[model samples]
Target: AVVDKVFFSRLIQILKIMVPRTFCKETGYLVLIAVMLVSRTYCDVWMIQNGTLIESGIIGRSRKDFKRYLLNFIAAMPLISLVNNFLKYGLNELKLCFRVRLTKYLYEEYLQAFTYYKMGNLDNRIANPDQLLTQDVEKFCNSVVDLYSNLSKPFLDIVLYIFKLTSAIGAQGPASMMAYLVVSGLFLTRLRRPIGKMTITEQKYEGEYRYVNSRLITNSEEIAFYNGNKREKQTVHSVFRKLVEHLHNFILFRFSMGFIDSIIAKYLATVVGYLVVSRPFLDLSHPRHLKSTHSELLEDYYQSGRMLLRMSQALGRIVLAGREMTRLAGFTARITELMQVLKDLNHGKYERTMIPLIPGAGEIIIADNIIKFDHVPLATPNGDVLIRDLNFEVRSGANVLICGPNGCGKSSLFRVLGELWPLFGGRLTKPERGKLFYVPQRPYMTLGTLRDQVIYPDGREDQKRKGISDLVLKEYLDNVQLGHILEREGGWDSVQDWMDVLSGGEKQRMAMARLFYHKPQFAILDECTSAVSVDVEGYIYSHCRKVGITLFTVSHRKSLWKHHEYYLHMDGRGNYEFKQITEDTVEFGS
Candidate 1:
């Protein structure tokens, strides 16, 4: 299946995306590059002819003809050089154009809505998305355009050379040449199956090896705390070994494969080339043999020899380009499946390995100002249903404190509420996006200034749209007790990698300021303030009440009870209670 029908069709599918219009910029490049390719081959023919003419002039001692042929050779050099460079220029330009188109198309699909989050957390098809987006895309683009020029130039050269060879030496010689190439090409294609499959395997292990290394970089602090360097080293080495094993096998396969290709496609063809070219001069029955002088006979051999070399070289290029396509086939499959996954996700179609999908799974309705889950099953994406037939509804201004033992469908309920996890079977009603916000256990600090930190997920234009300025945003920061940092950490415009700079508590408080600035109608606090002081946590809850924002607090700090009016508790054994957070209910029986 190296370059089979499936590969060709998938290649076309991606090419359609890359070059949408029949007469676009890429097509213009194609036409011009092809012109250059033809001109370059024609130059090869002219040079071969011109060299023989010069040789005839010298051997016959016609000094005047030699000088005249030499002048013609010098005159055509610049045109030859210009055509060759333009051919090169066109290939590079086309490569960049292909990359830009494919990147924009895939990135748009990737970052659109919740697809990015789902691809990472829920759907586990892609091992490393960052690799696909950056490295694989660039590699695919280079291969596509590189193969184009390699393919096009040789094929055209072969055609023009074939025409010339047939007339010069006759049809019988050219017929054998074509037959030998076809036979060898057929056998070469059979031996190339493993190379394509190995290429794909190599890319996967490369991606996974990088994934393991990046994981260690990201969680270095956690590993350090656990004194887990030895275990981490073993994991990294294991993944690296997998990558090295595949690459070692890939190189060895190519070594043996290339041995076969070079022997049949090049050297053997060269042997046949000499035999075919010598026929016109050496055979006694030939027409040129009957009347041609010694100088004329010598020139004919020189001319025929050069032309045959060009023909076989052209045929060799065409053969080598086919192998390039085999490698390109692997990249094509990768990016094609990436696009397929993104499209499936956008169309509400996805596959989870551990979860057998239930048909007619869930329904979502966007009501004006409420959150409702009617008979909703609190099931993880892995199909672990923690609570079945869960029922609850909360209107604007009402707060619900969600409670349960660990792994007892506490945060899982919020996932269903946020449309992050699939709803297996029930109804979920919620306010439109942007009206509800979820603050997590570890808050994300966006890349930028203190101002950007607070007004995150919002640009200056959005800040202006909200009719809020940095001066007003100071009050939000002041409310969360994060105002002191403005002076300590430069000013509002001072940019830094906020994630690393801010302490865990400061990040939590910054998240609170962020939530306050957006002032969404409802906010979910999933242990969002555990790092901050209880006093600051108390102040944060009071500010939410002051701003008329509803809450879904996910913490067991009995101290947070006064901030909410209702409680939804899920027992680990698929049981739950939704009751008002009265003193009698708040009374703990643990």
Candidate 2:
């Protein structure tokens, strides 16, 4: 939660600081100074004569002075525009990089901490985290930067135009513009609330449609394989149709606001400016210069009118963008929630004592009043209890075979023992973390060389120290009758889709080969040899004996009892029957 708060606070800070004033002022100053220098150097050239611009129109002291001022203003205009453009491009890139980095870090934390697994347990309103991370984050971040950049330029333009208007109309100019702005701003603000809510609703529906499209693309095979294409298409069409309905109303509201606001806002500023400035001229309360030609007087009035109109338009756009930004705030809120879940996952800090790195290889003691693996009770949503009282023990070097029928909670028991699941009751004392290696039915096939497949989770430091090598890895594969293929495919250095390329039996053999390389004190084989032949399975058990690694296998195959010295059978009644295997036993069944 602390991390989440920090991330959100930084996002707010970025939005607040990355405004138009910061962008325009620095670039404008540099361009102004540079243009002034150039104009002073070329003062004798540029001047306007009889409403005509020329490089050299006059030839006296008045001409030089006029040329200097005229040229400076002209040069400064384009330079300021160019500098503004350059700064915008650079700032745009910076903004992109900043948002991307934030998104990447948050996603990494979520994935690394196993938040995906935890989220399944929590009924948070977040759907499709994959889409949120990949698509929504990208869209939200990129759109925000683009919108802000566009908004910043217009805002700067309004501010400068306001300043010019004030100078042109004397003391009355600022007050008239302020009154116009206040009234227009109040209306726009009140109008924006509904638009903001509508925008958020639109984003949610669009995100849903996009998520469906992404799923269609990624899971096309699964959908077709299950003959679910029709059902899926129905769901997609239904979501999209609903989205269109809502979006139509949203667009109508926006267009109505834009058109009505644009017209009223434009004329209001124009009328107010003309009225205030014209009142002074008509009354002739100021300097006699004000009583000039109609053309000259109208020029000043029109200039004031144009500035006020631009300011009004800019204010309207700002309100509209504010609505979009408010919608984006909801996205940021979701991102923050995801980050909080990840932080909890990373800081496990289980109240139970931390397991030692090297636990003594003595008799295991299982405390009573512990949770049962078979009968998990769910009474509430968040505080549901998965298991009840359960107790068991095993001595060092004891080959324990855990047996149970389908869905009798064998996997759940192993997960608890492996420290992946939190305990609901009772105490389980076992070997150290990392010292215990778990080989599941379907092993994870990371995208890397075969060497990574074996020496995963542990770095190169452990690999070299533990004597893991290509020769050693292949030797074990050969023992399991998978060496020839490994060698032919460039050995352990080969990078292939090992999961798809290798058959189920071959993959199981590969997993055994990995176990043989990293000899741990305890090994939990969760149906790890279901795909292998009976003979190959026996060879794997023999190899485990050869390496002196204590094995705990959960298999339904009765043929496995001969190799095991003990049994812990889950009777599927919330209690397990403990027995010792002997040479006299012929067959075992659930």
Candidate 3:
């Protein structure tokens, strides 16, 4: 209701500027009287002609007119109401559909491929996207419908009023419109500017409130774990204080506008009405005045007074609407910024694309000093340069173990091969497209069933192609030692949180099960079994070797060295050399 009032207020200002004053006044007066009495017959010739049927007394003057008014009002009310409601409802649905399409486009750009990961590594200010995508988009689309509907009725009123006023007083009709336009223009210029900035601040405050609430919910576990209740209370209070300050300022701005707008509008209407009517009475040269009768003269007086009152009402509305329109403009600006980001994402404006796809099963080549970062002069910073100033190749089906201390660029080398990060130096020539997979220390569990978590990318298609049912995926779960949980109410069909449900060691085993299902040519395990016992890690690696899945892993465990045929060892000084580990490096506890 508050939003409707705000919109209606703005509609008056728009009508005042776009519509002639005489027309606006007449239309509003007629509608006001017609709606009050609930009939068109109340606006008929005789009722208007009778002095007893003045603007105030039109409803009660004649029972015959009132009866006719009720008949027309009842007959057309149902259809008129239906059309009116449907027009708004249909437009809202259309706007919402478009909003959904636009949001999907935004989500794809935000979540697809490596976009989200790459954007996070860069220092950009696209923060709190969840709120912008969900809350703000909904509000923006809803506002479009509300703003359109509210503006429509006032416009109709403006047009109909102009025609009625002109038929009543003729050429002199323009004077009231002119007066309104000038007054509304001056008032709007003053009223609109501050409102825009204020509305933007309001949105900021609202976002801050939402952010604090969300933060509390997301970190509820940590808050309880650390007993940080007092600190959380202080943080919430600060956010609430900011919101209170903004609301206080907005209320003050409203009152200030109201005080000045009300007086100016009231007098502007009354004075302009009297001036237009006085000329006709005093034998003015206005072309339409010569044809006026004594009855017509009386109407001119009443309409002049009515015009003055309506102008005041319209002016007050303009001031109030000025604030809402400012808010609409601010929302448009935010949407425009988001759209620009999406545009950049689509064009790949900020990123450099390297490899098109992974290659077929073959040896990997590393060219010398082909790509170098200019800032690094100390061979390698943080000891994260892999095979620096050296060329190397791994034979097909060779089990390669990458061994280095914690900061020895072992994981960095894996990332370069995975085509996730830009290579700081050396050209890597690898297959464009190949069945390659990387098992990170922590894998992602998307929201869905056990079937979804297992097949993931392959999804339902792989299940159909492999002739595997939910039971088959469940079998893999049992093989990975999670079958007991699957037998519960929401096991394979169970809708439970697996990330929290599964232990770290268990997740690694499940990931291995995933590898078995997909059967990629090459797999890189970056300490994926760090949480598991050494025996289990050895078992997983040995199983991969036996299956002929060429393996690359970065691990500090000495026991892992025996599983691989060649060891790529990086020294602390950025130099790398590979060696064939023999029985000396691998003592079988002898």
- Cα lDDT listed for each candidate: 0.78, 0.62, 0.60
For model 3, the stretches where C-alpha displacement exceeds 4 angstroms are 1-63, 107-113, 122-132, 139-156, 174-177, 180-263, 274-387, 423-427, 431-434, 469-475, 533-535, 571-573, 582-590
Candidate 2 lDDT by residue in tens digits, 1-590: 12356556856754443343555443453454444434432321121121222222333335764676577677656644554456555555655655666665765677664456555543344556777777766666776666655566556656665666666676666666677688877887787778767778888888989998898899888777778868887998899899889978888888898988887777666677667667656666676647676545645555555456666666667766665555666666666566665665577432212122111212334432122233222111234333454445566667777766675566565555655555453334555556567877887777777777777777667778876576766677788898678655776678887768877877777777777877777887777776777788877778778767778877756687666778876566555566676556524543
**Model 3 lDDT vs. the true structure?**
0.60
Residue lDDT tens for model 1, 371-417: 77677766666545665566767777787876767744566666666
In candidate 1, which residue ranges exceed 4 Å CA deviation?
Answer: 2-4, 55-67, 176-279, 282-295, 353-363, 381-383, 392-398, 487-490, 581-588
User: Candidate 1 deviates by what RMSD?
Assistant: 7.7
Q: Choose 2 or 3, whichever is better by lDDT.
A: 2
| TM-score of every prediction relative to native | 0.79, 0.66, 0.65
Clashing pairs in 2: 370-426, 371-388, 372-388, 376-386
**Global lDDT for candidate 2?**
0.62
lDDT of 3 by residue, 1-590 (tens): 23455455544532343234565432443344334322322232233334323332343466665565556555655754554455445565556654665576568778866666655553154666668888877776666546654554444444445556666566556555666767676875777578778888889888988998898999898779877889989988998988897798799888998787776766565666666656556766656645756545555566544543443454445445446565765555666566666566544354323221211212335432122222221222233333345665666667667765575555555555655554444344554434567888887777777777887777777679888777777766665666776655555566777788778887788788888778777777887877776666666667776777777767756666656778766565565555566667633221
Full ranking by lDDT: 1, 2, 3
* Model 1 worst lDDT window (10 residues): 353-362
TM-score of 3: 0.65
Clashes of each: 0, 4, 18
